[PDB]
Amino acid sequence: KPWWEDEWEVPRETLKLVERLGAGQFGEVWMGYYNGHTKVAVKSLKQGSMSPDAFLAEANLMKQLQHQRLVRLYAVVTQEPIYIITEYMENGSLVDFLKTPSGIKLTINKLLDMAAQIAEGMAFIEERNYIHRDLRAANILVSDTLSCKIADFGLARLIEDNEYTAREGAKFPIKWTAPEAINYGTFTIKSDVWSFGILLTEIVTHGRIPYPGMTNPEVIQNLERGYRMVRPDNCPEELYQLMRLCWKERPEDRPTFDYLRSVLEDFFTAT
Ligand SMILES: CCSc1nc(-c2ccc(OC)c(OC)c2)cc2nccn12
């Protein structure tokens, strides 16, 4: 739909950018207000940094993926500089929040709760035939009520034939990415399941880097021998075995996200 008919388009004047939360190669993210009263996050495109078409494809995906557990598209401004305006998440990134005084005090019970909210969001994505491909604690946001949502849909893709195949050159973070995706560029929902397992280690260690003390080649080398990440300090064995299920050699032997949700809810109500 053209901008003059798109329900998501808003006049730039409705927005007041108050506090810059981040700045990078491709633009800025601000906390702001829509029509004076409603707090929003606003991502801006640095003109010439990258294609505006590529920038806006993120918002177009979000139009197709609406759910309580996913950060919600709020609006777009499709004239330069381009803004993607989204649901504001007051406690920021999960990776950051887990290190603050509040996040530090969380019981294993609340951690397992949050793990299950994240799985619930991914179960939606799974049911809708999408994949995320960038699933990790940096890409989970936390509300003021300590609930969690999936964010950053820039790499997310609709899958018709089960499989998305990236290009020869394309690079992905080694620690978080399923072997098949790193080796062949092939992604499925099961590649997200493997990433969820890594994300679980981030939850339980309060945002520490996976594979403590290992370089990328050491990780690759270890996985090929059949080793998986060493038991994080203070990880319940139950959760550790659930991470192992996510790290199964064959994609198709990895559990579904609805299963993960289910199990984690059981882990939560039992604690
Ligand atoms: C900047 C990454 S995107 C992003 N960050 C925060 C956020 C909230 C509180 C913070 O407190 C430190 C923070 O860190 C800069 C980020 C909130 C938020 N809502 C939607 C996207 N958001």
Is 43 assigned a ligand-binding role in the annotation?
A: yes
Resolution stated for this PDB structure, in Å: 2.2
Length of the chain: 271
Token digits of residue 9 = 């388009």
List Cβ neighbours of 188 (8 Å cut-off, separation of 6 or more): 131, 159, 162, 163, 164, 251
- Looking at residue 213, the DSSP 8-state letter turns out to be T
Write out residues with Cβ below 6 Å of ligand 1. Answer: 21-22, 29, 41, 86, 88-89, 92, 141
Q: Are 112 and 217 in contact (CB under 8 A)?
A: no
Query: How many Å lie between the centroid of ligand 1 and the Cα of residue 41?
Result: 8
Q: How far apart are CA 21 and CA 259, in angstroms?
A: 35
CA dihedral 210, 231, 191, 181 (to 10 degrees): 60
Is 106 assigned a ligand-binding role in the annotation?
A: no
Q: How far apart are CA 43 and CA 28, in angstroms?
A: 6
3 state SS of 155 = coil
- Which of 6, 96, 134, 192 is labelled catalytic? 134
Question: What was the structure determination method?
Answer: X-ray
Q: How far apart are CA 22 and CA 28, in angstroms?
A: 6
Q: Are 82 and 54 in contact (CB under 8 A)?
A: no
Q: How far apart are CA 73 and CA 270, in angstroms?
A: 35
Is 25 assigned a ligand-binding role in the annotation?
A: yes
For 11-76, the three-class secondary structure string (H helix, E strand, C coil) is CHHHEEEEEEEEEECCEEEEEEEECCCEEEEEEEECCCCCCHHHHHHHHHHHHCCCCCCECCEEEE
Please, what are the domains in the chain? 1-88 (3.30.200.20), 89-271 (1.10.510.10)
Q: Are 44 and 28 in contact (CB under 8 A)?
A: yes
Query: How many Å lie between the centroid of ligand 1 and the Cα of residue 90?
Result: 7
Query: How many Å lie between the centroid of ligand 1 and the Cα of residue 203?
Result: 18
